Design a protein around this ligand. Structure first.
Ligand SMILES: Nc1ncnc2c1ncn2[C@@H]1O[C@H](COP(=O)(O)OP(=O)(O)O)[C@@H](O)[C@H]1O
Ligand SMILES: Nc1ncnc2c1ncn2[C@@H]1O[C@H](COP(=O)(O)OP(=O)(O)O)[C@@H](O)[C@H]1O
Ligand SMILES: Nc1ncnc2c1ncn2[C@@H]1O[C@H](COP(=O)(O)OP(=O)(O)O)[C@@H](O)[C@H]1O
Lengths: 439, 154, 459, 35, 449, 66
């Protein structure tokens, strides 16, 4: 569907000069922060430099998450990109520091390569020997391509997969020999006229040619957190999905770091360093910063990019204030990129992009009035007015939206600048910090 | 480590240890039925139940190393710890797929051994002749290689 | 067994019983005194626009605030939206004081309620053979295998439903079902099509007297078809998919037979699981099998969420698959619960408040309280004279709205105890002194309750 | 073959063989042998 | 091959007489701290240590943890070094004093010789022999086996307990599987089908290995590096043997528990029994607690009794705080956050700020470490930023200025690239100035105060 | 209905020579001793014994964690 960051298709800079284009790939209307984020993106794609800190500071509704999603769309589905929010760390299951350690180790991909052995061909006969009331199984599978005619054997798991798949005579199946999955591709004969509970006639494929035992080289990418969970527990796997991981001791991490270094040297694995994005870091207390400053000290730390909103705020868990709510022993390590509020000739084209994304057609008078509203209430009210005016124009059966639809939507739904006045007018029928009356 | 036990010097302590720390009801319930019980339940005239109706051990979720901690080197790291061996692997795969038959010569019989392994892993048929190989055995081996084309490397 | 009572099948009167919908025109303009509401024009028009946004499937993570004082109709508009959307679109009305748990972090119950608010409709087919077994007769093969005894090529089963019976030829590898499940003559089974392994439901009811004491469940004959080719619509919320992938329901071992045997614990769900489920649901939509239907997460009393929750709500609303979030706040300048620093409007932080389409809610006129009294009175069935309506409206204007809607039940009780059928002025003037409001209670509390003594309150 | 029941499925049809030693047992009640 | 923040540090760079020579092996200057760290290192490598307190004071950005990595690369690989923080010990399963003691016993190592007794054979005949089993509910029970192992030189035909049979049975050992019964626990890992049953027409993807050469009853010695905390975890949650506590104890989820005083004393007596047999060697180590001011008073209370032990590693505390308030009780202020009673144990090492030429040397070393070559005017510009703004701000203006240099086709970094990267990427001070100046009033284009 | 094996009697002591039992003498009293005991139970012990299985057959409690 159409979320609030679906129009963005990357960061929109040059590849040779990385100059900020004034209108390219959604992120339209800002030049300094997009150029600096392009430099950060290039030193992430280099992968050499480890353990930095980028702080995208600025007023709200200025496109900070938009720049973050622009870097996310620009890396593709290769490099990990954790979209961590700062309130998720405060768990009750695990400690507050170990949640940060997992959040760092989720953003270091390990890309390994392994050889599987796939089969191909037409099943000629199945032969299954079963015991009575519990016991082992025996299996002989005769399979034929256009060239070879093999009679393979089977174990218990292969028969448990065959009966799960219901592989009859005359099926084009492909068995991965290593993993042990069975995917029926279709049939070569037709459906028999002797049995009732047979099934559905599948796709008509011919007999495959070539060889039986073919080899394949697959590439598997796991984060370090998955390696930590599968090597921290004897039988309790799958806890890396259902979040049941209590604590991983340090003896496990100091062995997995060494084994990943050995896999890096052997040419088995490759370390792909990633991005940890922390949205609204001002909610973390000082007990988190006293670990974040020291986890950025090793070869396995991701390049942290994080946002903020606040001016001189007080740091949680303390008694004193600081710029951005972050301590001044942590603000030495970071590098702060500022963002600026917008200009109306940029708000016009941003609302034009948001209107063309949600498939809404406009008139220039309505767009001028909409820009006039967006000057005084931000983009977050104007985009909602776009969608609302689309549906009100759909209610009265109009092709394009007009001035009257925007005025209707402005009359119905208040911007916060009028809701503050609505609070400040009737203070006697709203619960403040005190009592309230009823007429 | 094994779990801590109690050194109490009565017979009852030993009986309670072998009835709690081992407790054969749970072991029978976990691993499954005795094959004698399977025979008396599957040759009888009427169907009868089993107190472990199937093996209630959970399936381990890691195929190569289940329920232990005892690992061993990996022929993988073997074939890559030697640059020659790594390059021989590529070449033997291509040779095999071509239907070529190889004499493969070494200056060290210790290496002949290491390799012998590797060939077992990649499951190629081979013979061996070295200075340890007795004379009529020599005749025999060479004759094989020459009689029976299944053998890929000598 | 269970004896059926032939009584009256009535219903109970809640506080929002009379609400039956928004009551709009065909153009969106509200109309007063329609479908339960009285007045409140602009709020009902805006909620109609919200309902249109929900049914148009263009909402993908919006947010709607309901301001206004207590006792003015925010929850009434919420139930009006929930009854306007219907039943086949989800609606999860949590409160603010329901995210605080003791098994998980409080920024996780929010995400599970998002997943409760999203529905998924799946249309599939069901092909089963069905009914009571009459025969299990084998058939000898044409070419028996040498070295063995019997060699059976096709196994015949006669299945008899409650409408018609049918002979069935089957592949012989149904035997492993029949020996393991102990299927005999007179046991209803179902045979599926994708695998074909029959599973016994139970002994039929016609054979419930061949023996005397040997009893189990005696299920009846399947009163339906013998060859179901029936299609099924199936509604699963994404919360159910998260739970069934995180904690599997039915396993065959010891420890998963202790997991369903011990108490189910809410556990936090890693984000890779949710990302994978979204990536696969968005694939099955593109195949054209499953329909995504977003719903409403009406978080009532939104000023109980502290500042650690709105930070997670910003992330959760920026997701590409999210329902609408209809908040409900009835505070003015309030201190946010988490950070005791900033006094913000509505209890909402100023960063989060920009996302919200703020719908106002105004107090009621002193000639609309009596119309609400008339509608509430004809809802409960309590009928009453016009001077009684004017007195209840007097108490409604001068004291409260929720208090004049609660002088109808004791007045009706005293009316049908005194010996009448309708409520007069005397019954309300008598019931106004058995049930004091908050105002006269505070007057007694301050005036008579002077200080802490013997016959005094405990301040 | 002592207690194992064979199932073989070819292009013509699919048959199930039972060892003679199991026909007297309770396993042959489905196959039509019985006690 | 990733240049972290601490890559150029390769040691303290000391002379033979223990005198720190400046600009050697990564450091620049900092004499009185590196000589004291060399004294600490030779205090570690002499084993007359049962708990000594070494504090590393000094402001932020002066290289407190650079000395810690220098110590950890000066001790070597075979000496334990446990670095933690002050925020790491606030757990949710155990009390934090348990986490302190677990780190203290992570920081003590032991080197043990062991004699494993493998039975490495190929299974020939596997036949169970059940015993009498009267009416007791569970039914029959296998009690004796006759597994025949077949090595290359001399087979053997041995008899087993029930428990080692269950160890076999949870490994799915058929006839033909080579195994290696470990007669220390009882464990037995299947390796694969023997090559006498080899067939290329196979589907199980088994690993075919040849028959194990040598005697079937081998006996081999190895050397193992085990800390005392590993022994604590081993005796606490048992995961060895073939009984029920040590088998149902590896299917549950693992939880950190509170290893009490009695186990921590009994394992000390067991290790002393190992040392008296001439087998094991004890090697004590370092607990480096960075950011010690985050520890509250309930931890500095327990460090007294944790250091009074006859076996306790040397503690190295780091604390970049001046006169500050202790986290536990908010009514006594002290230097560094350390309480005034615990501070007397510590041998306090100061750390002094830098100079406008030492910053130039550190910038030059960091540039030739990362791989960014540049001109001397650019080095003077970065040193000017280092004097004015911060030390670890001007080091971070080299990584964009390389990339921007590669934008303009250059190789070395000139004045223009740093003059552009000082405008794209800002520090904290000018950002706070822009914050205070522009953020005048809260509203639409303001900041949330 | 509570039973305890005290040991092996000393008349069958030297049957073999290094058996491992606790050889105790035959009791030089009655075989049927009849005594009466007054004994108290608190209701909380009834509550605990009716809620959860206690002590006797509660063998899964040797794990300890949950
Ligand atoms: N430069 C921009 N280009 C495109 N869209 C933008 C830009 N700036 C803001 N927006 C839109 O405005 C909305 C607010 O941006 P966001 O980053 O969420 O603000 P904040 O940083 O305050 O959270 C986003 O939905 C985004 O689509
Ligand atoms: N427009 C209306 N028409 C009829 N009844 C109303 C209307 N608005 C409010 N009510 C009644 O007022 C009562 C209290 O309103 P309520 O929904 O509790 O206010 P809030 O939403 O602030 O909690 C409800 O029982 C509802 O029946
Ligand atoms: N003597 C030195 N030589 C080289 N670099 C130094 C020196 N002292 C400090 N640094 C640099 O200072 C940076 C931060 O030092 P660090 O120890 O983290 O400061 P703190 O003492 O505040 O923890 C490191 O990247 C390191 O390169």
């Amino acid at each position: 569907l159409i979320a609030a960051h679906s129009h963005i298709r990357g960061l929109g800079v040059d590849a040779d000069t990385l100059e900020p284009r004034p209108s390219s790939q959604g992120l339209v209307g800002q030049e300094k922060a997009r150029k600096a984020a392009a430099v950060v993106l290039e030193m992430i794609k280099q992968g050499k430099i480890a353990g930095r800190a980028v702080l995208i500071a600025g007023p709200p509704s200025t496109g900070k998450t938009a720049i973050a999603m622009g870097m996310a769309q620009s890396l593709g589905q290769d490099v990990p990109f954790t979209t961590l929010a700062a309130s998720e760390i405060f768990s009750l299951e695990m400690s507050k520091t170990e949640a940060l350690t997992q959040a760092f180790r989720k953003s270091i991909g390990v890309r390994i390569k392994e050889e599987s052995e796939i089969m191909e061909g037409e099943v000629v006969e199945i032969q299954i020997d079963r015991s009575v009331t519990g016991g082992a199984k025996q299996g002989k599978l005769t399979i034929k391509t256009t060239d070879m005619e093999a009679i393979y054997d089977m174990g218990s798991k292969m028969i448990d997969a065959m009966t799960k798949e219901r592989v009859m005579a005359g099926d084009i199946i492909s068995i991965d020999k290593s993993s042990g999955k069975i995917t029926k591709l279709g049939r070569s004969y037709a459906r028999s006229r002797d049995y009732d509970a047979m099934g559905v006639d599948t796709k008509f494929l011919q007999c495959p040619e070539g060889e039986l035992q073919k080899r394949k080289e697959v590439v598997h990418t796991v984060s370090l957190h998955e390696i930590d969970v599968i090597n921290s527990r004897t039988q309790g796997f799958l806890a890396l999905f259902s979040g049941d991981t209590g604590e991983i001791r340090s003896e496990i991490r100091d062995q997995i770091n060494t084994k990943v270094a050995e896999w890096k040297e052997e040419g088995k694995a490759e370390i792909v360093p990633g991005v940890l994005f922390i949205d609204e870091v001002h909610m973390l207390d000082i007990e988190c910063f006293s670990y974040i400053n020291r986890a950025l000290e090793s070869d396995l730390a991701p390049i942290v990019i994080m946002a903020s909103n606040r001016g001189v705020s007080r740091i949680r868990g303390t008694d004193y204030k600081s710029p951005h709510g972050l301590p001044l022993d942590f603000l030495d390590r970071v590098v702060i990129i500022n963002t600026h509020p917008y200009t109306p000739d940029e708000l016009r084209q941003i609302l034009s992009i948001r209107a063309q994304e949600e498939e809404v057609d406009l008139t220039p008078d309505a767009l001028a009035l909409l820009t006039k509203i967006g000057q005084e209430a931000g983009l977050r009210y104007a985009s909602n007015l776009i969608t609302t005016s689309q549906l009100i124009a759909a209610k009265r059966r109009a092709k394009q939206v007009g001035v009257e639809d925007v005025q209707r939507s402005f009359k119905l739904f208040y911007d916060p600048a009028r809701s503050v006045r609505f609070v400040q007018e009737s203070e006697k029928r709203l619960i403040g910090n005190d009592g309230v009356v009823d007429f | 480590a094994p779990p801590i036990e109690v050194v109490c010097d009565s017979r009852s302590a030993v009986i309670e240890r072998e009835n709690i720390m081992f407790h054969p009801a749970m072991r029978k319930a976990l691993f499954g039925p005795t094959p004698s019980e399977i025979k008396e339940a599957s040759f009888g005239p009427r169907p009868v139940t089993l107190y472990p109706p199937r093996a209630l051990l959970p399936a381990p979720d890691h195929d190569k190393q289940r329920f232990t901690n005892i690992t061993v080197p990996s022929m993988a790291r073997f074939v890559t710890d030697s640059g020659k061996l790594a390059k021989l692997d590529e070449l033997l795969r291509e040779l095999k797929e071509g239907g070529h038959r190889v004499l493969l010569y070494f200056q060290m019989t210790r290496m002949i051994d290491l390799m012998e392994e590797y060939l077992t892993y990649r499951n190629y048929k081979y013979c061996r002749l070295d200075g340890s190989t007795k004379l009529e055995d020599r005749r025999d081996t060479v004759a094989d290689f020459q009689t029976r084309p299944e053998i890929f490397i000598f | 067994i269970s004896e059926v009572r032939g009584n009256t099948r009535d219903h109970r009167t809640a506080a929002h019983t009379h609400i039956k919908g928004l009551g709009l025109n065909s153009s969106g303009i509200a109309e007063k005194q329609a479908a339960g509401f009285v007045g409140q024009c602009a709020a009902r028009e805006a909620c109609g626009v919200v309902v249109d946004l929900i049914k148009a499937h263009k909402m993908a993570g919006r947010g709607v605030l309901l301001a206004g004082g207590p006792g003015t109709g925010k929850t009434a508009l919420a139930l009006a939206i929930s009854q306007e959307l219907g039943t086949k679109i989800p609606f999860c009305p949590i409160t603010g004081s329901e995210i605080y748990s003791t098994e998980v972090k409080k920024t996780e119950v929010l995400m599970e309620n998002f997943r409760r608010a999203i529905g998924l409709r799946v249309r599939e087919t069901k092909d089963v053979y069905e009914g009571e077994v009459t025969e299990m007769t084998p058939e000898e093969a044409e070419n028996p295998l040498g070295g063995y005894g019997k060699t059976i090529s096709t196994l015949l089963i006669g299945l008899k439903s409650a409408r018609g019976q049918k002979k069935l030829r089957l592949d012989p590898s149904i035997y492993e079902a029949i020996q393991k499940e102990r299927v005999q003559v007179g046991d209803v089974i179902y045979i599926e099509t994708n695998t074909g392994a029959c599973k016994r439901v139970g002994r039929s009811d016609a054979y419930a007297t061949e023996f005397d004491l040997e009893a189990e469940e005696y299920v009846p004959i399947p009163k339906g078809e013998v060859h179901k080719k029936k299609e099924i619509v199936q509604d699963v919320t994404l919360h159910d998919l998260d739970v069934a992938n995180a904690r599997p329901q039915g396993g065959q071992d010891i420890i998963s037979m202790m997991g369903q045997l011990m108490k189910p614990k809410m556990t936090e769900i890693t984000d890779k699981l949710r990302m994978e489920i979204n990536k696969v649901v968005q694939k099955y939509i593109n195949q054209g099998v499953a329909e995504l239907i977003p719903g409403v997460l009406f978080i009532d009393e939104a000023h109980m969420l502290d500042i650690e929750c709105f930070t997670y709500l910003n992330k959760a609303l920026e997701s590409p698959i999210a329902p609408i979030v209809v908040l409900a706040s009835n505070r003015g300048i309030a201190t946010i619960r988490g950070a005791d620093d900033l006094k913000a409007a509505h209890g909402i932080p100023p960063d989060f408040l920009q996302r919200l389409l703020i719908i106002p809610t105004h107090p009621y006129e002193p000639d609309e309280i009596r119309r609400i009294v008339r509608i509430r009175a004809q809802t409960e069935g309590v009928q009453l004279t016009d001077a009684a309506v004017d007195r209840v409206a007097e108490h409604g204007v001068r004291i409260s709205l929720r208090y004049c809607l609660q002088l109808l039940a004791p007045a009706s009780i005293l009316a049908r105890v005194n010996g009448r059928t309708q409520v007069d002025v005397q019954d309300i003037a008598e019931a106004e002194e058995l049930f004091l409001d908050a105002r006269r209670s505070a007057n007694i509390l301050t005036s008579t309750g002077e200080s802490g003594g013997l016959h005094g309150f405990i301040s | 073959d002592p207690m194992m029941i064979r199932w073989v499925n070819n292009k013509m049809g699919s048959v199930v063989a039972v060892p003679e030693e199991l026909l007297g047992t309770h396993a042959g009640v489905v196959f039509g042998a019985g006690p």
